[PDB]
Amino acid sequence: PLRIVRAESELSTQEKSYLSAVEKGDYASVKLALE
Amino acid sequence: PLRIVRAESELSTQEKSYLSAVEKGDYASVKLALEEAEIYFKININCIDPLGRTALLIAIENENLEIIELLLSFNVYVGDALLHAIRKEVVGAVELLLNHQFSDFTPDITPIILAAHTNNYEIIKMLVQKGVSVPQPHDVDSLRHSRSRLNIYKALASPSLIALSSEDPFLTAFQLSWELQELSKVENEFKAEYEELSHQCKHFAKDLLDQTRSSRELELILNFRNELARLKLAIKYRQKEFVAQPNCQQLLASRWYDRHWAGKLITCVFIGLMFPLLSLCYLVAPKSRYGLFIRKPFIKFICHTASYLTFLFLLLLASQHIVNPDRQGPKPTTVEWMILPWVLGFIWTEIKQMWDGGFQDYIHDWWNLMDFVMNSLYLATISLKIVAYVKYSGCKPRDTWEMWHPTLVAEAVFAIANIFSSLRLISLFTANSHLGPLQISLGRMLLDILKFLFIYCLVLLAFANGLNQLYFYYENSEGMTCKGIRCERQNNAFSTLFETLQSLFWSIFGLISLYVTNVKADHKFTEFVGATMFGTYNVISLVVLLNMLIAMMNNSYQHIADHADIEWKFARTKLWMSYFEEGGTLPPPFNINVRLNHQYQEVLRNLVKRYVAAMIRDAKTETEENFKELKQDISSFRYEVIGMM
Ligand SMILES: Cn1c(=O)n(CCCO)c(=O)c2c1nc(Oc1ccc(/N=N/c3ccccc3)c(OC(F)(F)F)c1)n2Cc1ccc(Cl)cc1
């Protein structure tokens, strides 16, 4: 069969770096994000 | 034994240190080692370690992305590294590898199939966002034809894949679990894996239904597509786990019922006493005062039970001496005239149930063949009676009648018929919480008894053959007014095959005396042989055969009684749902979607979202939740030290 996503939207491109920074633990980069 | 290494080789003297540096995570050493761009001193970046691991695959094993990217920038050969990253469940490696003869994977395995096998939500969604398709399940090298078919069914039966690529996850789980169960019967070599795959599909529907927050959602899921349409659909697919769920069981019990031990039996008896009052009230005027009172399923169930116990009463009253002597070809008495409406109602119910199903799944159950036999016997009884009434007359002593007389056969068949009528009442035990589970697990271990009959009957026939062959030359019939073993002086136990077959059955209970092995002659050798074979039959059947029939029933009772509450609840709801409709509210004695889709999908989206959230964000802990805490602390330390300088 052919499968496609069902009712799921994409978030963003820039915010991926912010999420990775808040996940890993880089305190400098996250502070740059909220600046 | 001067052993040697057979069928192998040696890697190198230089690349061993490079592989070690890759393993230790040294960024600078492996960066300078790879800097031999287009001018190499005979060092292969595609070297394979003695265990088969490669430098690119080594970094995947530690999910360290820096050397992964460094290797990828130099165009190292991948081949199947994406499959390894998918199998090891590394999101970063899959992200990096998604945009750029010996294999340890089966040739028909595709990345989507393996990703669905690992049941990782992130990787499956990532692959689906790019656009993939699994071959449909729909012979020359049959070993890999069955393996390929099994793999695609394992990927299809995964909660992660169903949750994001199915129009209705509540429906694709019913059908796929059904066909997985019936596919384990045509492929008997893999029946232990197909049936364990179907069992996990039944749990998925129950878990998805477990996420309801309010009774508004629950009544909308089961009423999709007159009333409780989807709930009856789950019963058809034999979804015992889905049906036997507490939240829906509560609603079903609320519909059923619409007090202490001495406060419930007394009022049940009180209601059952006036059975023929609010049954004639129904025919006279279906008003809310009395006509609608019997519409309650609990009241209707009591009416049908008390009306059946009444039938069993005057059935017991037809054998009394008070109510047509020993006359030949008699007319029916006053009891039989009252019996006739019950038989007619039962026959009418069986007739209206016969064509409602077309003998498919209608006679396949054990509780319908017995009913059919009962009505057949009753019909034979009435036919024999009416036949004998019109061709026989005159008062004659009963002792002088010849056997096979129509009246005698009629009463014998009637006596046989009402044994099944009283034994059918055992089917009502499933409505009581105490005798319910006991009765359900009673008829389930009975199927294991039927397999010992196949050896018991063989032993019986084997010994009967020898006993008859030995004793058939000594039979006599002079001086014997009575003949057989059903006599005060048993004389001819082993004379014929029909007598030998039933004189060995009565010896199980010890009702055959020891002098039946004697002959009217001074032949001690044959008598001893016959006694020895009789004793050997006694030992085998009573000390060995019947001793190990119970030796497995308790060892099979353990498996049956494990999930003994789901089966009982399924039986009880099957019984309940037969009293929820109109058409049967008449005891046998007195019988003779544009917006619906909108709401359903908007509820189902929330249900699926809650299920997936509770499945990913609440399963990392189920020890592993604190493993990433140390990694977070170490990463923060590393970032602080690196950025400070
Ligand atoms: C089957 N039967 C039998 O039909 N009648 C009726 C004959 C006419 O009424 C017996 O009277 C009888 C009997 N069985 C025994 O006693 C045993 C029990 C177990 C034996 N062996 N067990 C095993 C178990 C494991 C391995 C090996 C042997 C055994 O040894 C034997 F003879 F080989 F069976 C004899 N008696 C009583 C009897 C005994 C001896 C004698 Cl001289 C006369 C009568």
Q: How close does chain B come to A21, measured CA to CA in Å?
A: 10
Per the DSSP assignment, residues forming a β-bridge with B48 are B54
Contact at CB, A5 and B125, closer than 8 angstroms:
yes
Neighbouring residues of B201: CB distance < 8 A, sequence distance ≥ 6: B157, B173, B176, B177, B180
Structure tokens at B123: 């990787």
Helix, strand, coil shares of chain A, percent, nearest 5, are 50, 5, 45
Q: Is the distance from the beta carbon of residue B544 to the nearest atom of ligand 1 less than 6 Å?
A: no
Residues in chain A: 35
Query: Contact B464/B504 with Cβ under 8 angstroms?
Result: yes
Distance CA B4, CA B409 (A): 89
CA B256 – CA B580 distance, rounded (Å): 8
**Structure tokens, B342:** 């019950």
Bridge partners of B54? B48
- B417 within 8 A of B382, measured Cβ to Cβ: no
In this structure, which amino acid lies at residue B134?
V
Residues at the binding site of B for Ca(2+) are 350, 353, 368, 371
Å from A35 to nearest chain B CA?
A: 18
Q: For the CA atoms of B404, B409, B412, B413, what is the dihedral angle to 10 degrees? A: 140
Chain A interface, mutation test: which of B63, B123, B128, B607, most A Cβ atoms within 10 Å? B128
Q: Which of B463, B524, B528, B532 to mutate to test the pocket of ligand 1 (most atoms within 8 A of CB)?
A: B532
Chain B residues lying within 8 Å of A9, measured CB to CB: none
B543 Cβ closer than 6 Å to some ligand 1 atom: no
SS3 string, B512-541, reads CCHHHHCCCCCCHHHHHHHHHHHHHHHHHH
Partner-chain residue, chosen from B136, B165, B633, that has the shortest CB–CB distance to A4: B165
Atom from ligand 1 closest to the CA of residue B533: 4
Q: Which of B501, B476, B502 is nearest to B491 (CA)?
A: B476
Does any ligand 1 atom lie closer than 6 A to the CB of residue B447?
Answer: no
H-helix segments, B274-365? 280-284, 297-316, 334-354
Residue among B281, B170, B186, B154 at smallest CA distance from B218: B170
Q: Which residues of B135-169 are buried (b: 16+ CB within 10 A; e: fewer)?
A: eeeeeeeeeeeeebbbbbbbbbbbbbbbbbbbeeb
Decide: B133 and A2 in contact? Cβ < 8 Å: yes
Decide: B516 and B490 in contact? Cβ < 8 Å.
yes
R_g over Cα of chain B: 38
Chain A residues interacting with chain B (CB cutoff of 8 angstroms): 1-8, 24-28
Entry resolution (Å):
3.0
Ligand 1 pocket check for B278: Cβ under 6 Å: no
Helix (H) or strand (E) holding B128, with range, is: helix B121-130
Whole-Å CA distances, B87 to A19, B42, B387, B562: 25, 33, 79, 35
Contact (CB, 8 A) for B35 and B27: no
* Cβ distance of A8 and B125 shorter than 8 Å: yes
Contacts of B635 in chain A (CB under 8 A): 24-26
The whole-angstrom separation of Cα B104 and Cα B123 is 20
Q: Which atom belonging to ligand 1 lies closest to the Cα atom of B532?
A: 4
Q: Which region, left, alpha or beta, applies to residue B42 given φ > 0 means left and ψ of -120 to 50 means alpha? A: left
CA atoms of B359 and B361, how far apart (whole Å): 6
Per DSSP, chain B holds a count of helices (H) and strands (E) of 30, 0
Tell the burial category of B220 from Cβ atoms under 10 Å away from its Cβ (0-12, 13-18, 19+): middle
Q: Report d(CA B189, CA B204) in Å as an integer.
A: 26
Which of chain B's residues have a Cβ under 8 Å away from the Cβ of A26?
635-636, 639, 643
- Whole-angstrom distance, CA of residue B343 vs CA of residue B323: 20
B184 alpha-carbon distance from chain centroid: 13
Q: Based on the number of CB atoms within 10 Å of its own CB, is B409 exposed (0-12), middle (13-18) or buried (19 or more)?
A: middle
Can you tell me whether residue B54 is helix, strand or coil?
strand
Q: Which atom of ligand 1 is nearest to the CA of B534?
A: 4
Number of H helices, E strands in chain A: 2, 0
Q: Are B417 and B377 in contact (CB under 8 A)?
A: yes
B42 close to B81: Cβ distance less than 8 angstroms: no
Structure tokens at B81: 């590294």
Dist CA B127 CA B113 (whole Å): 11
Pseudo-torsion of CA B205, B207, B208, B213, nearest 10°? 140
| Residues found in chain B | 645
